Design a binder for these strands. Structure first.
Lengths: 94, 278, 258, 139
RNA sequence: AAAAAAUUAAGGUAUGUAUU
RNA sequence: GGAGGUCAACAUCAAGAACUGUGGGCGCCUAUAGAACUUAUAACGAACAUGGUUCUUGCCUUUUACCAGAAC
């Protein structure tokens, strides 16, 4: 992802460079009308948010020394065995 | 109608036409109703053509009766381009109806018709709009109005065409007129929005599926919110993995207890799991 | 503030406007873009303001765009209810007589103009042409004297001070003879069983009940059930046929009534 | 979601399409808040690793870069658009628009087939491919 | 002199090279 | 000053008894806001159209079309 890093264009339009192919009074009045209507006319975060404040306390050393990649079902081993078992087939005898 | 009435309070709005008039662009005067009608037909004709023009559909044309025709038999690729939305067609057909009515008054004014024939005609027009325009192809709903008009036809003719009683004459049109006037009242704004949106684009160009994914997003944010931003990204990825593993562990009845974890983090994830499980 | 101007100005604009026509006036965001969207609204005013079968013509007030973008019709029809009723009944009378008069009543072909045929100008083609008289009725002059003098105007009564609110035309009141003429003329159109008693099972309440209970009157409209479940049909001592005594239909009308 | 990177300028979009010679370049065009642009952002993120050898994925937001709205014509919450050697690829899902992708695909597996189909057909210069499963009914 | 209508639309784009 | 203004702007808009808060005037009176109950939803409009959501009927399990009931 080297480009991702760099950050600078030439003062260049995107479509052209690649070689791209594609396959005020009334307004004011409208706005006013809309307004005449606006005038006339979450939970999860709440549940948690309260915990998130609780976190604030934790030190930066602890943030580092956090165990990283623990698997408890041995999912990888079972999955591989399953693929091996299901690989090929065989033809049934005559 | 009686069973489910509505009742509105709208202090908020002062008329489109009262408001529209104010400022430099607009002017007011008087005019022959027929003359105005003629103007309206031309206006609509031009505007629809403008839309078509903007869309690049140069192989289609409207006639003066608002029928959309092909100028050249088109290829299926071109047919796909031509596929034009219902809303447009509703407008077009609407104009077609309007035109038809206006034209009969024009011909009466010419003195080529007859006041009696005229009345009979406009009566006929309203009764048979489903045949004369075919608008229903673009709203099927409108059938209600059509059917109502049909019923009115049946009743009224029984009342004056059962004496003396065979062909035309008739000329009563109040009832049917009312039906269409109300119908229009109910559709105006839909068309206004469609047209308006179209034009501005001309100048611009719980549930299972939902919940679980939101749940993660909320949790990661707050945890990614607290991360000291020397180490945020790295610290995070493994933060994601624990949630996935803890939820696996919940499924399988494995307990999911871990060596070194701060208690505050360990709280949050358990809370999340309790929520996800439910 | 908001002055009214001569119709000739408007005519001048549209004479100029035709030339601009269609695709060539592509630019105009401020006039053309704004004007068109409410154009559909404009149709409603015009149709509602249809001239009526006893009028020769209707002149109306309009708001037009300076660009020639659009015309809205300003007026709202305010009618006097008894008068309007009488007027429509008048024409009803006329229609019957006219039908009696002759066998070969010509109905219009419809699509009045050819697909390719362009618009005839109102200003030249139409303005000269003349009205050609409309419907009306041969009311007896003696009987309808008070009524006849004004009966077929755009305002059923001009701008009397005693008769009317005034120019604005909200609020109205008549003398007894005026009412009696109006009433008598309107009689063919309005005939009802005036007593509340005729509508024993035809009022709103009874219909509401018939709907709610899924038991329409023979005359009456019928809806879907409203209440879904008719499933329970449980035989039981209270209910049992040996126990019950049987006479009489128990017609649906009884259910609505009681 | 934090797995998959994002493209913050239209100039990041264009270089990213060019520099990847050997693999698809798959882009989701749509905006973070959307209901349906979050769902796809998942079904891709799970798949992105499996496929790293023939397909590369990125994320773009209509609001962040609106430069590309008119040329490719972008409507609705999100559009999945496949590129190989600067050539916009194209597939018929039975949905009636052969350009891009709209609807939300359901399984991980049926998504990997489509990527794999597009790549394989694409490698041969073929401009149309056929999605094995045709979700015209779905969308 | 025995009898015709009351149903509508999108899911239909061949690649590929060459020329403009 | 008066009527009329098919002229506009700005507020409100069923009625009634009773509770609470604020402001004004000399415990009382008046105005405004909120809640509860009644009338019959006697009608702000003797008029009545469209759309969204959620449910329940028919569906190609598709629409920028619908069928006909419900509530918001």
């Amino acid at each position: 992802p080297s480009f991702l890093d760099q950050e600078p264009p030439a003062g260049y339009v995107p479509g052209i460079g690649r070689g791209a192919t594609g396959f005020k009074t009334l307004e004011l009045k409208l706005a006013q009308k809309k307004k005449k209507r606006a005038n006339e006319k979450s939970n999860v975060k709440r549940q948690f948010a309260d915990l998130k404040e609780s976190l604030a306390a934790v030190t930066e050393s602890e943030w580092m020394d956090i165990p990283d990649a623990t698997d408890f079902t041995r999912r990888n081993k079972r999955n591989r065995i399953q693929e091996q078992l299901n690989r090929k087939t065989y033809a049934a005898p005559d | 109608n009686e069973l489910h009435p509505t009742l509105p309070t709208n202090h908020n709005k002062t008329k489109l036409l009262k408001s529209l008039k104010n400022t430099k662009y607009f002017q007011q005067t008087t005019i022959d109703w027929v003359e105005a009608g003629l103007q309206l037909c031309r206006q609509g004709h031009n505007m629809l053509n403008l839309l078509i023009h903007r869309k690049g559909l140069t192989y289609l044309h409207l006639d003066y009766n608002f029928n959309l025709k092909p100028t050249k038999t088109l290829t299926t690729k071109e047919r796909k381009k031509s596929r034009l939305g219902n809303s447009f067609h509703l407008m077009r057909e609407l104009l077609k109806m309007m035109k038809l009515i206006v034209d009969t008054h024009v011909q009466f004014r010419l003195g080529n018709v007859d006041a009696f024939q005229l009345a009979d005609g406009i009566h006929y027009i309203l009764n048979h709009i489903g045949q004369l325009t075919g608008i229903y192809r673009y709203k099927y709903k409108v059938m209600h109005q059509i059917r109502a008009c049909k019923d009115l036809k049946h009743i009224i003719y029984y009342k004056f065409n059962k004496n003396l009683g065979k062909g035309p004459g008739c000329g009563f049109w109040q009832p049917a007129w009312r039906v269409w006037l109300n119908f229009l009242r109910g559709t105006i704004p839909l068309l206004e929005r469609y047209i308006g949106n179209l034009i501005t684009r001309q100048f611009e160009g719980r549930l299972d599926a939902y919940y679980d994914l939101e749940l993660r997003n909320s949790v990661m944010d707050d945890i990614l919110e607290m991360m000291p931003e020397s180490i945020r990204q790295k610290k995070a990825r493994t933060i994601l993995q624990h949630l996935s593993e803890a939820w696996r562990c919940w499924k399988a009845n494995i307990p999911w207890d871990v060596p070194g974890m701060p208690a505050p983090i360990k709280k949050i994830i358990e809370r999340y799991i309790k929520s996800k499980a439910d | 503030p908001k002055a009214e101007m001569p119709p000739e100005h408007l005519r001048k604009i549209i004479n100029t406007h035709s030339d601009m026509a269609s695709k060539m006036y592509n630019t105009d965001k401020k006039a053309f873009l704004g004007a068109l969207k409410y154009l559909p609204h404009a149709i409603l005013k015009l149709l509602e303001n249809m001239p009526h079968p006893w009028e020769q013509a209707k002149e109306v007030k309009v708001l037009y765009h300076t660009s020639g973008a659009i015309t809205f019709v300003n007026e709202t029809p305010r009618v006097i209810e008894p008068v309007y009723t009488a007027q429509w009944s008048a024409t009803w009378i006329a229609m019957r007589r006219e039908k009696r008069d002759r066998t070969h009543f010509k109905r219009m072909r419809f699509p009045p103009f050819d697909d390719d045929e362009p618009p005839l100008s109102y200003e030249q083609h139409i303005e000269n042409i003349e009205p050609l008289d409309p419907i009306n009725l041969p009311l007896d002059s003696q009987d309808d004297e008070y009524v006849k003098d004004w009966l077929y105007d755009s305002r059923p009564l001009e701008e009397d001070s005693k008769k009317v609110n005034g120019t604005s035309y909200k609020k109205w009141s008549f003398d007894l003879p005026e009412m009696s003429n109006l009433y008598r003329l309107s009689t063919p159109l309005r005939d009802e069983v005036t007593d509340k008693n005729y509508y024993y099972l035809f009022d709103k309440k009874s219909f509401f009940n018939g709907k709610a209970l899924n038991n329409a009157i023979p005359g009456g409209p019928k809806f879907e059930p409203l209440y879904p479940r008719e499933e329970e049909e449980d035989y039981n001592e209270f209910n049992s046929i040996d126990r019950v005594i049987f006479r009489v239909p128990i017609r649906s009308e009884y259910k609505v009534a009681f | 979601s934090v797995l998959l990177p994002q493209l913050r300028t239209g100039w990041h979009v264009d270089q990213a399409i060019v520099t990847e010679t050997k693999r698809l370049v798959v882009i989701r065009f749509g905006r973070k808040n959307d209901r349906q642009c979050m769902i796809m952002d998942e079904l891709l993120s799970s798949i992105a690793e499996r496929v790293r050898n023939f397909a590369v994925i990125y994320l773009c937001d209509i609001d962040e870069v609106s430069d590309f709205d008119e040329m490719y014509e972008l409507t609705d919450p999100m559009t999945v658009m496949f590129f190989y050697h600067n050539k916009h690829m194209m597939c018929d899902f039975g949905t009636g628009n052969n350009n891009k992708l709209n609807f939300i695909v359901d399984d991980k597996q049926e998504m990997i087939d489509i990527l794999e189909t597009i790549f394989r057909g694409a490698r041969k210069n073929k401009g149309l491919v056929v999605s094995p499963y045709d979700y015209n009914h779905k969308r």
